[PDB]
Design a protein around this ligand. Structure first.
Ligand SMILES: Nc1ncnc2c1ncn2[C@@H]1O[C@H](COP(=O)(O)OP(=O)(O)OP(=O)(O)O)[C@@H](O)[C@H]1O
Ligand SMILES: Nc1ncnc2c1ncn2[C@@H]1O[C@H](COP(=O)(O)OP(=O)(O)OP(=O)(O)O)[C@@H](O)[C@H]1O
Ligand SMILES: Nc1ncnc2c1ncn2[C@@H]1O[C@H](COP(=O)(O)OP(=O)(O)OP(=O)(O)O)[C@@H](O)[C@H]1O
Ligand SMILES: Cc1ncsc1CCOP(=O)(O)O
Ligand SMILES: Cc1ncsc1CCOP(=O)(O)O
Ligand SMILES: Cc1ncsc1CCOP(=O)(O)O
Ligand SMILES: [Mg+2]
Ligand SMILES: [Mg+2]
Ligand SMILES: [Mg+2]
Ligand SMILES: [Mg+2]
Ligand SMILES: [Mg+2]
Ligand SMILES: [Mg+2]
Lengths: 258, 274, 258
């Protein structure tokens, strides 16, 4: 899996314009929909228990985010997840805040036990707190082997590992940490890619790589204006990034282990 | 504040009359109360403020009735609807109708799921609507059909005739109609398809105009045209930059577009019918 | 007692400690608030569920309650979280958005005051007056701070801030903030940010509002005649860009004799 494969997956997301159903936090709804529209995908947000199962089945991908979770909303995520698995719709989870409060940790787990997930995307602390029922390259694998899915731990360096493989990504910019939704949007981007790419691990890597190179390009363009401009430039790049920009910038390293 | 800026007795709703309505909106700065989806809250409010109106969001049943009666226009949006929201939307719709406040509906997603479809229909049965804005499919599921897939008149006008309201089906070409009149607008830019809320914001702008224009057909036409021109103006400064810059520019133009810009750029076409 | 040089000193403190500001606010300003705080140098977090508000607040640096789009459930949650804050010495800030415009907002605002010890209350003259009751702006702020034994920050053209025995007048910011939704909500949260590192609440409010106002000014010059949209973005950049220096320079703080 390299730069060439990634770039090609980006073109397929644009060619099919995957409908991504997100049940996420109200701090990133607008950013997320705008990011997906820019990428070339079709976003849709639905949270009511009277329709999440109906919306998930006609979708290309379902993404769950607990950022500002509620009891009834968590209830809806699982309902939607079950409807999704029943129809072959890839499900991606973003364990926002897992470990911060007991409720988020419980909820993350709850969803993982009730929904066949295609991938989980979060920071190291969140993956660890979620998976740490008792007593990050090695963290990814163990988590991916245990939960049996694609574990994507993003940060200065991205660590994506699946049942038997491990990859590290080297793109993006530190400015991404100053924009709320950077992760929520990314997680949703991952869903858009899993919708057109049969291999989850490959979808994650491509989605994250495309996202990163887009962020670098926005970064240089943003010069030193600030967080506001960068945010705006990211939405622009997700649209202007080309299959080529990915090919010559994407840094994908297949980790050799045991 | 709701007067009339054009009458068919003077001819077809035109470009100058629409320019008139824009100044009127900015003169009175109507308080536009919208019970909308949480994907477009911030953008809606910023767009309305840029235009010159007064945005306000209130969803609680404990207050919607009160907020609606002192509003210039009420706008209902089911983008991320819930049972509570719909009940609220109807509570407020009724109170708005009871106080003569024009109510605008944006059937976001009608058709995608039967829940959105039923809710949109529940609102229409319970609330008198001044206008309804949405795309071709949403409009079709809201009013009736079966075999989805002649909108530039037929659908728009027949929809208006059944629900006795104003039907505005936006798109590359816009079809606005009431029980016996229909128009087509040719303003805007393709980049509005890349901004979330572009339509929810527009339905809101429709509310503001309805608050200053007695005739909803006219208010709707003036609203969409001013919105489209601003869009056009916005795309020019930022077409090579991307959706992000466009989004921001659109907000900039909604405040700097003048009635001059609207009178000279607006392209409104009266459709011969019946 | 408090001046520009000290104000700027606080801005540095915020960025140094990057306090966790817990906001239970309206869904019209959530994305703007988190981005604004991030650019400033604070760490925002939003949590509304009663199954976690007490837990999130006790681990925060400051709690802010904004009733912009209030519901019965969120108001009860704001109180539950308020009390938890009180018990852990976490400053609480209240933004009575719309108080006086609707009876429910008025009562929800008063109910919160009755149950939660607050460090400050930020809002426009009308909201403060309808909330606290009737006894210019300087007299109003002073009487209010005295009755509720808290800090009253009535922003606007000229900012009037006062605790039970002191009153200050601020003269920064720019008119365009009037055209950006959430300008007040982000400010309140900014206030919470300053309260998280400045022991005296009155000094905190002043420092927060001055910094915010200077940033607003700078963004407006760079914005000029472009529009509300470009301003909103520039404001985000400036909350990141503005320096201790800029505050010491532009900050215009004035103590009133009464
Ligand atoms: N310091 C950094 N330098 C370069 N790229 C980064 C950095 N931090 C994150 N990224 C990248 O930013 C994107 C943002 O995802 P990120 O892991 O920050 O989200 P998150 O869910 O908000 O987490 P966190 O709470 O830790 O901010 C990814 O493409 C990631 O590789
Ligand atoms: N292809 C286009 N070319 C020019 N203007 C357009 C185009 N599509 C929409 N507009 C304009 O954009 C505005 C946006 O309304 P639109 O019909 O896209 O909203 P919507 O509710 O988001 O629908 P949709 O889901 O189909 O994106 C109107 O002013 C309309 O005339
Ligand atoms: N006319 C003005 N000129 C300059 N600065 C202003 C003006 N009005 C407000 N500000 C500043 O704007 C910031 C915004 O707070 P503001 O009082 O407008 O918020 P609000 O909660 O939205 O209230 P309101 O509903 O009355 O608009 C503060 O820094 C304040 O000093
Ligand atoms: C600030 C904040 N508080 C609760 S969710 C949230 C946003 C989630 O953001 P991100 O995708 O960056 O993790
Ligand atoms: C992405 C999304 N999901 C539910 S509502 C919504 C926004 C509605 O947007 P628009 O006004 O463009 O039709
Ligand atoms: C338009 C609107 N409607 C309900 S809350 C809200 C935003 C409140 O904003 P601000 O902090 O500027 O007062
Ligand atoms: Mg982050
Ligand atoms: Mg995250
Ligand atoms: Mg659209
Ligand atoms: Mg729409
Ligand atoms: Mg306010
Ligand atoms: Mg304001």
């Amino acid at each position: 899996m390299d730069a060439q494969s990634a770039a090609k997956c980006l073109t397929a997301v644009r060619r099919h314009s995957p409908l991504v159903h997100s049940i996420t936090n109200n701090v990133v709804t607008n950013f997320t929909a705008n990011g997906l529209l820019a990428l070339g995908a079709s976003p849709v947000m639905a949270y009511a228990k009277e329709e999440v199962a109906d919306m998930a089945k006609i979708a290309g991908a379902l993404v769950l985010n607990i950022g500002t979770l509620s009891k009834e909303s968590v209830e809806a995520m699982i309902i939607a997840g079950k409807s999704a698995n029943e129809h072959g719709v890839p499900v991606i989870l973003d364990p926002v805040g897992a470990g911060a409060t007991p409720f988020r940790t419980e909820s993350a787990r709850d969803i993982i036990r009730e929904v066949r997930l295609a991938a989980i995307r979060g920071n190291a602390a969140e993956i660890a707190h979620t998976v740490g029922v008792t007593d990050i390259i090695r963290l990814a694998q163990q988590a991916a082997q245990k939960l049996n899915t694609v574990i994507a731990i993003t940060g200065e360096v991205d660590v994506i590992a699946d049942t038997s493989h491990v990859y590290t990504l080297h793109n993006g910019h530190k400015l991404l940490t100053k924009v709320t939704g950077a992760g929520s949007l990314l997680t949703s981007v991952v869903g858009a890619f899993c919708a057109v790419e049969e291999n989850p691990l490959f979808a994650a890597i491509a989605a994250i790589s495309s996202y990163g190179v887009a962020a670098q390009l926005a970064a240089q363009q943003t010069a030193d204006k600030g967080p506001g401009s960068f945010q705006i430039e990211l939405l622009n790049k997700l649209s202007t990034v080309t299959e080529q920009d990915v090919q010559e910038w994407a840094t994908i390293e297949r980790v050799t282990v045991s």
